[PDB]
Amino acid sequence: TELQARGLTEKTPDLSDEDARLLTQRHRVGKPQFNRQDHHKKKRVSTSWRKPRGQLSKQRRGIKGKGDTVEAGFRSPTAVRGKHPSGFEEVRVHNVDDLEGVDGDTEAVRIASKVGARKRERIEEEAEDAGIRVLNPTYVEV
Amino acid sequence: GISYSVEADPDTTAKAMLRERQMSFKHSKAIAREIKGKTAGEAVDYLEAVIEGDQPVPFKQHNSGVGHKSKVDGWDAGRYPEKASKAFLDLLENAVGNADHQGFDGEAMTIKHVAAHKVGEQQGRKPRAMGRASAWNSPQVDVELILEEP
Amino acid sequence: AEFDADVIVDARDCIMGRVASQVAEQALDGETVAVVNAERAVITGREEQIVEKYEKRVDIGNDNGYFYPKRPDGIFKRTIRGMLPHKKQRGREAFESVRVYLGNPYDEDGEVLDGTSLDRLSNIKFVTLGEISETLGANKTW
Amino acid sequence: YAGLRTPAESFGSGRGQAHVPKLDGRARRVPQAVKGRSAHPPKTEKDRS
RNA sequence: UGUCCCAACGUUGGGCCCGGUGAACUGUACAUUCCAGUGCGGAGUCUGGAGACACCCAGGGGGAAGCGAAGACCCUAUGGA
RNA sequence: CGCUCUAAUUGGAUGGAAGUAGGGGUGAAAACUCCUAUGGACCGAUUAGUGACGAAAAUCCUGGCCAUAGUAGCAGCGAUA
RNA sequence: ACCCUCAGAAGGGAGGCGAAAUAGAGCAUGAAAUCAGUUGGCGAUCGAGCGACAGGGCAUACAAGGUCCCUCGACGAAUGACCGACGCGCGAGCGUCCAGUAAGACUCACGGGAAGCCGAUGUUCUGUCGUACGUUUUGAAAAACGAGCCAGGGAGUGUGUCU
Ligand SMILES: [Cl-]
Ligand SMILES: [Cl-]
Ligand SMILES: [Cl-]
Ligand SMILES: [Cl-]
Ligand SMILES: [Cl-]
Ligand SMILES: [Cl-]
Ligand SMILES: [Cl-]
Ligand SMILES: [Mg+2]
Ligand SMILES: [Mg+2]
Ligand SMILES: [Mg+2]
Ligand SMILES: [Mg+2]
Ligand SMILES: [Mg+2]
Ligand SMILES: [Mg+2]
Ligand SMILES: [Mg+2]
Ligand SMILES: [Mg+2]
Ligand SMILES: [Mg+2]
Ligand SMILES: [Mg+2]
Ligand SMILES: [Mg+2]
Ligand SMILES: [Mg+2]
Ligand SMILES: [Mg+2]
Ligand SMILES: [Mg+2]
Ligand code: NA
Ligand code: NA
Ligand code: NA
Ligand code: NA
Ligand code: NA
Ligand code: NA
Ligand code: NA
Ligand code: NA
Ligand code: NA
Ligand code: NA
Ligand code: NA
Ligand code: NA
Ligand code: NA
Ligand code: NA
Ligand code: NA
Ligand SMILES: [Sr+2]
Ligand SMILES: [Sr+2]
Ligand SMILES: [Sr+2]
Ligand SMILES: [Sr+2]
Ligand SMILES: [Sr+2]
Ligand SMILES: [Sr+2]
Ligand SMILES: [Sr+2]
Ligand SMILES: [Sr+2]
Ligand SMILES: [Sr+2]
Ligand SMILES: [Sr+2]
Ligand SMILES: [Sr+2]
Ligand SMILES: [Sr+2]
Ligand SMILES: [Sr+2]
Ligand SMILES: [Sr+2]
């Protein structure tokens, strides 16, 4: 009568104190948008980042207000970089065999969009029985 | 051409459309805007009065150079686009006709939705001085109308 | 016509600029202020030079316009306006919660703000807003 | 010779137009022109062994 | 002898309003400006003030160092004729 | 980092591929990825190659389109109809 | 096809076919520019590189993010008190002690709370900074040059020889 998601939807990974601290830092500090200079001024200029190269470029010259310039200094903490917000490390899965070797306590699985409903159903029941959470679960009426 | 841009309940609604009409698109927006919400009958009487020159159509957007009209309410500029008005009369005639054929009281139905869309231009050319020719086109207009029981 | 002022200031024998400076400060802090007896407010210096300056403001102008007040009423309020960011929301709000009056339309007597008083027994080189207005050609309605 | 089979010439300065070779009011030959030559295309002379 | 003093009235066609038809030039963006100043020394856009309720019609063209034409002058090129 | 096609190894797709639209997540970033709708047949990953491989700009090219504008013109000619 | 409408082999309406007519004739898909209608935010007293970063308003079906707020407590870097006591200075005020104490960003735990609620997205408001971009140039917001807008197109390639 209502929609329910398959699998261990509420599962949380177990992280060391230091990893939870750094994951919490990443989430608190965040980062600037880092969109290309003046993308908002011209429709033909997309948001995709490009190093401002104009000799007189205000952003290139680092003028406050013209947006931040990509620099290594903005990198996220190594210990948490790339983690899903939940804290899990993601593993891209295309079939049931891809579930092999995955630690459901430290990794969550993400089924490629290309995968069909039939193969997804098998992957989803096998992941749950392996204690692995599926990030993009199927919702069935139960 | 267009497709109705608004949902319509067949059990309490009647529809109609004009296709590729060669008339002012700008006049059509003005007219649609003015008759929306009116009853089919009121719209008709209104448009006949426009063609007769007794009731101006407010020109709120395409108004450059347009002289003011005392009978325009809450606005200044207006005109009497008789051609696009006659086209709307055909549309209403079709709408009300369909309406009645379905068992509704056509004239009494409210104009729930009415919008004009420019579907293209009939291209023309006009010779100019100095050996050159410039565009001389005709707008092509589609217009949708949905009538609804009170 | 009725102005619930939290403060009623008496400008009599008080240095216009010093009162103005304090009324602006209070107005920005949320206080509703009514300056009274503006025609008796005072400005130090040599009357001839002072008048030359206010007459210059009266003569300045053109099509765009430089409407400078002649009544002690407006002279004083303009003085206050120049101490407020009257073109910003907060600034206009403050300025609009300040009113100046010829004489005292209230029943209470205004208070004399510290540091704004001029000792007539120790000063001979000063002028009265009212005197300036008369010279400017205003119709002495006070 | 792809894109080079045209006597297209540029009008130079004077008509408020970019100096692009044109023929019958159509731009041609140059790489930035639609129907123009390929600037640095695959070449048969290249040793691919 | 209306060239002028010194301009007036009138005529015809436009102009203005209405139906129909229906282009072009031009357009980095923003743009209600004005006075000063500053700045590559000739600013609607920077600074300080002043002024500024929105929209529309007609007008004569002050400004946009207006639009149109990669200055024809001048010089430079181990250029052309 | 991304693009084309080749090869080896290895996967996805009518229980819905690519693309597109809106939206969620990751990466300093190039860009990667998922969800929903549309779509209705193809699509990847790794490794070694391949190169007519990346655009905001050139009075750049071609196509499409907006403001200009319901504006100018549809009067002027010794043939005013 | 049939029917209705219409001056009408037009068009429209209803209907029939097909998995799909949003496959109905330059008829697979259907971007942007852009147009009509409409939803959210702003809006007829107010100011212009259109934003970046902070923080407020209002708006939000699901899915793909799940956090966030307040009492208190723990930890507690640099920094760092009030009050009180004593002692100086013409005075504003300062010194010694209280004391490197109380406080102190982040993070965490207990208890309570939020689900338009936290993130995020749209728009708008406030604060701070801010006169595009690319090029030319000693110096460009420039009254120096380029572009109306968008999509697609658009520039280190081959042979030989040498290093
Ligand atoms: Cl790195
Ligand atoms: Cl049009
Ligand atoms: Cl004035
Ligand atoms: Cl201000
Ligand atoms: Cl004195
Ligand atoms: Cl921390
Ligand atoms: Cl190179
Ligand atoms: Mg853009
Ligand atoms: Mg007019
Ligand atoms: Mg000719
Ligand atoms: Mg070619
Ligand atoms: Mg030249
Ligand atoms: Mg010469
Ligand atoms: Mg010679
Ligand atoms: Mg492999
Ligand atoms: Mg391209
Ligand atoms: Mg005009
Ligand atoms: Mg005659
Ligand atoms: Mg198609
Ligand atoms: Mg470039
Ligand atoms: Mg120079
Ligand atoms: Na308008
Ligand atoms: Na009116
Ligand atoms: Na009226
Ligand atoms: Na003074
Ligand atoms: Na004045
Ligand atoms: Na040829
Ligand atoms: Na070869
Ligand atoms: Na005469
Ligand atoms: Na002018
Ligand atoms: Na051009
Ligand atoms: Na907001
Ligand atoms: Na240049
Ligand atoms: Na520049
Ligand atoms: Na300049
Ligand atoms: Na154009
Ligand atoms: Sr899919
Ligand atoms: Sr208009
Ligand atoms: Sr103060
Ligand atoms: Sr020339
Ligand atoms: Sr200013
Ligand atoms: Sr004129
Ligand atoms: Sr669309
Ligand atoms: Sr290329
Ligand atoms: Sr046009
Ligand atoms: Sr005639
Ligand atoms: Sr003529
Ligand atoms: Sr049908
Ligand atoms: Sr401590
Ligand atoms: Sr392009």
From Swiss-Prot, chain A:
Keyword line: Ribonucleoprotein, Ribosomal protein, RNA-binding, rRNA-binding
Bias type Basic residues, positions: 38-64
Compositional bias per record (Basic and acidic residues), positions renumbered to this chain: 8-21
Keyword Ribonucleoprotein in record: yes
One Gene Ontology CC term in the entry: cytosolic large ribosomal subunit
One Gene Ontology term from the biological process aspect of the record: DNA repair
Keyword Ribonucleoprotein applies: yes
Region named Disordered: 1-87
Domain of life: Archaea
GO molecular function: DNA binding; nucleotide binding; rRNA binding; structural constituent of ribosome
Family (UniProt): Belongs to the eukaryotic ribosomal protein eL32 family.
Role description: Binds to the 23S rRNA.
UniProt subunit comment: Part of the 50S ribosomal subunit. Interacts weakly with protein L15.
Protein's recorded name: Large ribosomal subunit protein eL32
Shown residues within the full chain: 96 to 237 of 241
UniProtKB/Swiss-Prot annotation, chain B:
Keyword Transmembrane: no
GO cellular component, one term: cytosolic large ribosomal subunit
InterPro entries listed in its UniProt record: Ribosomal_uL22, Ribosomal_uL22_CS, Ribosomal_uL22_euk/arc, Ribosomal_uL22_sf
GO BP terms: cytoplasmic translation
Any one GO MF annotation of this record: structural constituent of ribosome
Keyword Transport: no
Alphabetically ordered keywords of this record: Ribonucleoprotein, Ribosomal protein, RNA-binding, rRNA-binding
Stated role: This protein binds specifically to 23S rRNA. It makes multiple contacts with different domains of the 23S rRNA in the assembled 50S subunit and ribosome. Contacts all 6 domains of the 23S rRNA, helping stabilize their relative orientation. An extended beta-hairpin in the C-terminus forms part of the polypeptide exit tunnel, in which it helps forms a bend with protein L4, while most of the rest of the protein is located at the polypeptide exit tunnel on the outside of the subunit.
Family per record: Belongs to the universal ribosomal protein uL22 family.
Summary of subunit composition and partner proteins: Part of the 50S ribosomal subunit. Contacts the macrolide antibiotic tylosin in the polypeptide exit tunnel.
Protein name per UniProt: Large ribosomal subunit protein uL22
Gene label: rpl22
UniProtKB/Swiss-Prot annotation, chain C:
Keywords per UniProt: Ribonucleoprotein, Ribosomal protein, RNA-binding, rRNA-binding
Taxonomic classification: Archaea, Methanobacteriati, Methanobacteriota, Stenosarchaea group, Halobacteria
InterPro entries membership: Ribosomal_uL13, Ribosomal_uL13_bac-type, Ribosomal_uL13_CS, Ribosomal_uL13_euk/arc, Ribosomal_uL13_sf
Coiled coil: none
Membrane-spanning residues: none
Species for this entry: Haloarcula marismortui (strain ATCC 43049 / DSM 3752 / JCM 8966 / VKM B-1809)
PROSITE patterns (UniProt xref): RIBOSOMAL_L13
Name listed for the protein in its UniProt record: Large ribosomal subunit protein uL13
GO biological process: negative regulation of translation; translation
GO MF, any single term: structural constituent of ribosome
Family recorded in the similarity comment: Belongs to the universal ribosomal protein uL13 family.
One cellular component (GO) term of this entry: cytosolic large ribosomal subunit
Annotated Gene3D superfamilies: Ribosomal protein L13
UniProtKB/Swiss-Prot annotation, chain D:
Biased composition (Basic and acidic residues): 42-49
Region described as Disordered: 1-49
Transmembrane segments: none
Domain of life assignment: Archaea
Family statement drawn from the similarity comment of this UniProt entry: Belongs to the universal ribosomal protein uL4 family.
Role: One of the primary rRNA binding proteins, this protein initially binds near the 5'-end of the 23S rRNA. It is important during the early stages of 50S assembly. Makes multiple contacts with different domains of the 23S rRNA in the assembled 50S subunit.
Assembly notes: Part of the 50S ribosomal subunit. Interacts weakly with proteins L18e, L24 and L37e. Has been cross-linked to L18e.
Name of the protein: Large ribosomal subunit protein uL4
Organism expressing this protein natively: Haloarcula marismortui (strain ATCC 43049 / DSM 3752 / JCM 8966 / VKM B-1809)
Taxonomic lineage of the native organism: Archaea, Methanobacteriati, Methanobacteriota, Stenosarchaea group, Halobacteria
Full-protein positions shown: 51 to 99 of 246
